[PDB]
Amino acid sequence: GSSTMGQVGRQLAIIGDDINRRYDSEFQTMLQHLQPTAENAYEYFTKIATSLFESGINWGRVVALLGFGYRLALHVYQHGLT
Amino acid sequence: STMGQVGRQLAIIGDDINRRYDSEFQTMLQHLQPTAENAYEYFTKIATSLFESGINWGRVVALLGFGYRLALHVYQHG
Q1: Alpha carbon B47 to chain centroid, angstroms
Q2: Most Cβ neighbours (<10 Å): which of A5, A16, B44, B58?
Q3: Residue A66 class from Cβ within 10 Å (0-12 exposed, 13-18 middle, 19+ buried)?
Q4: Where are the alpha helices (DSSP H) in B1-78?
Q5: Interchain contact A62–B (C-beta under 8 A)
Q6: Structural domain harbouring A62
């Protein structure tokens, strides 16, 4: 409800909607360029994570990798459905 | 292109997420006044209030990032 917990929850909804609208299109472009398959998806994800964390680590970088891994797995799943 | 470009682009995206919302996470934690005794209660009610208007991967990672910052706030203070 209108409690302080309900206030924070609705503020995270706006942050998450802003994260989704700012980077989902970029995730799809990066996945289209990588052309990942079920054979090299985990190999790609490990190489990307090491290149990512080579310049440091913060919670923003971790949630970006989590969101990209989810789009990665979703991309390999849907492009194999025949 | 290569995995290096994608990895470096996620570093840019991740650093962008960090600068845009960390202060907002800080401001919400100061108003919440979370302690070791109500942290999971707060997280659960916040998640409920968050997902009452839908769910996408952005909302999930935002809740995960805030829950990390929430636990770290209770751990380091209390």
Answers
A1: 11
A2: A16
A3: middle
A4: 3-32, 39-51, 57-77
A5: yes
A6: 4-79
Reading the block at residue B3, the tokens are 């995995």
Q: Please name which of B23, B72, B51 lies closest in space to residue A9, comparing C-alpha atoms.
A: B51
| Cα end-to-end span (Å), chain A | 45
Token pair for residue B16? 């962008």
Contact status, residue A60 vs residue B15, Cβ threshold 8 Å: yes
Task: Specify the experimental method.
Answer: X-ray
Q: What is the resolution of this structure in A?
A: 2.5
Q: What is the total count of domains within chain B?
A: 1
- B 2-21 near A (Cβ less than 8 A): 3-4, 6-11, 13-21
Can you tell me which residue has the tokens 């994570």?
Answer: A49
